[PDB]
Design a protein around this ligand. Sequence first.
Ligand SMILES: [Zn+2]
Ligand SMILES: [Zn+2]
Lengths: 46, 88, 49, 359, 178, 49
Amino acid sequence: QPMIYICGECHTENEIKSRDPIRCRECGYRIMYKKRTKRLVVFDAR
Amino acid sequence: VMGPMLDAATRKPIWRHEILDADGICSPGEKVENKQVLVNKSMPTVTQQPQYKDVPITYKGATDSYIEKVMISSNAEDAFLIKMLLRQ
Amino acid sequence: RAAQFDVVKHMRQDQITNGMVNAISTGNWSLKRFKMDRQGVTQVLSRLS
Amino acid sequence: RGRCPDCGSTELVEDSHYSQSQLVCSDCGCVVTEGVLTTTFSDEGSTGENEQVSRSQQRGLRRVRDLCRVLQLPPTFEDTAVAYYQQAYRHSGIRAARLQKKEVLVGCCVLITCRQHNWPLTMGAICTLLYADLDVFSSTYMQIVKLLGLDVPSLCLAELVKTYCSSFKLFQASPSVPAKYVEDKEKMLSRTMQLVELANETWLVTGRHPLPVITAATFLAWQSLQPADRLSCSLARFCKLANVDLPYPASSRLQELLAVLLRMAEQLAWLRVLRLDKRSVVKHIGDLLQHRQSLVRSAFRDGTAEPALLLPPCMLKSPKRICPVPPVSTVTGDENISDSEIEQYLRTPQEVRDFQRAQ
Amino acid sequence: GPSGIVPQLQNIVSTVNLGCKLDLKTIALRARNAEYNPKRFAAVIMRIREPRTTALIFSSGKMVCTGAKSEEQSRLAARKYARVVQKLGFPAKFLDFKIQNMVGSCDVKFPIRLEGLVLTHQQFSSYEPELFPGLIYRMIKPRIVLLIFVSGKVVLTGAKVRAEIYEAFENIYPILKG
Amino acid sequence: INVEIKKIMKANEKVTSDADPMWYLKYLNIYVGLPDVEESFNVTRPVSP
Ligand SMILES: [Zn+2]
Ligand SMILES: [Zn+2]
C-alpha cells in the first residue's frame, strides 16, 4: 500500500503517501523518480 | 489522481488502465501503445462534498513506446509536476 | 495623514522581475521612451546535435 | 439511441479509429451502430462583468495586493486573500468601522491565509507595515475570527524557527564577525531542535510568547559550539553582531533553562564530579544532549505512569496552601439597614459650602 | 461527582431602577462617597465599604452595581444605595432589582496541557498565547465562557444564576479529566 | 552586470519630494548577488542549472 520513490542525488527510498509537499528524508532535494516495475517484458532480438 | 479501475470479474485492471500503478501513474520499464492512459488526473466539477470528473492524460501516436523514466517534483505554489520520457 | 508616511509601505519589487522575465521569454520589447517595438529578439537553443 | 440498435442500453461513450468520432454504449458490444462526427473550434488567435465596486472598497483591495507583494509569496495568496476580504466586506459594523480598523483588517486576512498554508509568519511582522499597535490589532483580529468562525491552525513551533534561524549573519565571515564567531548553520539548528523539544515537554513553551524561547536557545547553542571562544559574550553583545534586537524575557528563559540543565547535570556522576554551576554547565550540553531522555526520567519526581517536580513554573513556586474547599455560603439579605452608615456618607452643609468654595 | 471542590464566586453584577429622575450635580455635591464628572459622563460613581461594592447611577434613574460576592449581598448593597439616595431628598424606591452576572473560579490540583484541548475542541477553544496566555472556551450549555490555564485553574463567567456556574463546572469536569 | 548597472543607477541617484524641502530618497550603491531559489518559508538555497 505505501509507495516508494527514490530521491535525486542520494537514492534513499523516500516513502511518501500523504499529500505533503515533496521532500527528501535528509536532502534538500525536491526531485524524485519512480522505481522500476516487477512485471516482465519480452523482447525480440532482431 | 486515482488508481486503476479493476474488473470484479477478473481482479485485473481494464485494458486502458493496464499500464498504471497503484498511485495512478505509469510504471517505468513498461510498454505503452495507442490510446492508453498515462496519468489518471481528475479535476473539480464543483469549481455538498466536491464531485469530480474524469480528464486523463493519454498517449496518442503511431507505434508503441517504452517508458524510460518518470519524474515527480513540485513548485512552492503547491502545484505538483510530472514528467515522463518515452523511447523508440 | 497627520504623521509622515513610510516608503517601505510601498517600496515594491515585483515590477522589475515581471518586466525582465517577460521580455526575455516573450521575445519582443517596447522601449517606448526610445520608441522602438522590435520583435524576434530571442530563439530557443536548437539541440538537434 | 441511448438504446442499442433495438434494446435497453442507455449510456453514451466515445470511440474512433482514424480521427473520427462515434458513440459507445453498452448492453452488447455496440457503438449503437450510429456514432456522430465532431465539430471543433481553434486555429484562431475567468469572466469580465466586473462591477464598479465602492471606491473605498477597491482602495482597500489595492492595499491587500500591495501587502502581499511585499513578502512576494506565490500569487494564489493574493487572490484568495482578496476573496476573504470581499467576504468580510458584507457587514454593517465593518463598513462603518474607522479606516484604521480597515488598515488592520487587511493584515489579518493575509495572515490567516499564510496560516492555511502552514506558512510561518509572526504577529509584528505584519503590524510593521500598518501603523498598528498590539491591542488595536489583536482585539480586532479576535473580532473577525469569532465573527466568521473559520478554522485556522496555530503557529507550529518548528515552522517559525527555520526562517528565524536563517536570518542570522553567523554563516559567513565579515568585518563584524571573524571566524571564531562564524559557525555552521546545520549544527546550530539541530541543537536548537534538541533544546526546544525539552522546552515544550518541560511546560516552558505553553502560555508564553514563543520567540524568546528561540532566542535563548540559539544564543546558548552558538556559545556551546565553541565555548572556549564564546563564553565571554553576552545577550546583547551577541545579538548586535547579528543586528538582532533581543527579548527582555530571554533573560527569564535563560535563567529558567540553566536551572533546568543543572538539574540534569547532577543526574550523571561523571558530570556530578565537576561541581557544575552557571559558568561551567554551558560547555557540556553536547554531553547532556546524548542522554537527555534518560536525564529527565532520572530527574523528575513525577514517576507516575500518567526528586525534581516536572511541572510548569506557575506552581513550582508552590501554593501557600493547597486550595482548601472554598467557603461557598449565603447570608440574610433582608435585614434592616443602619441609617447611621447612610448618614456618614453625606456631607454636612458646612462641608457642602467648603467644597463649593474649593470648586 | 467532582474532586471534592465546587467553584467559588468572585464578583456579582446587578441592576436596579429607582423609579424617579435625579439631579446628579446635587448628589455629587452632598455625597461623601461619590465621584462624578458632568462634562464627560452621564452617571455618578459611588461606593460603600460593606458590602464592599460600587454603584453607577444615571440621570435616567437606572443603577448598576458590582463588587458583590453573592446575590444577597448585591441586593443589600443596592438597598443601601437606595437609602443613600432617599436621604439626599429624592423619592428613591427599590424596584425591579435583578442580578445580571457573577464570576466563578476553581482549581483542579494538576496541570493541564492546553494544546491538546485546542487540538480536540476547535469549535470552542481559543489558543493564542502570544495574545493572551489563557485558553478561552466558549461553552454552550449553559451559555458560559470558561477560562483555563496550565496550572489547572479554571474561571467561569456569563451566568445569571449560580447553578449555571456549577453546571458548566461539572460539564467541563469530564472534558478536562480526559 | 558589473560596470553598467552602476552607471545607470548613478544617473538617477536621487528622487525629489512634492513638498517639504530637504526631503529626498537616495540610492548610493547596488548589488546583484548569486543565483538562488525561493522556497515556501521565505528561505533560500542555491541551485544548479
Ligand atoms: Zn535525498
Ligand atoms: Zn440490442
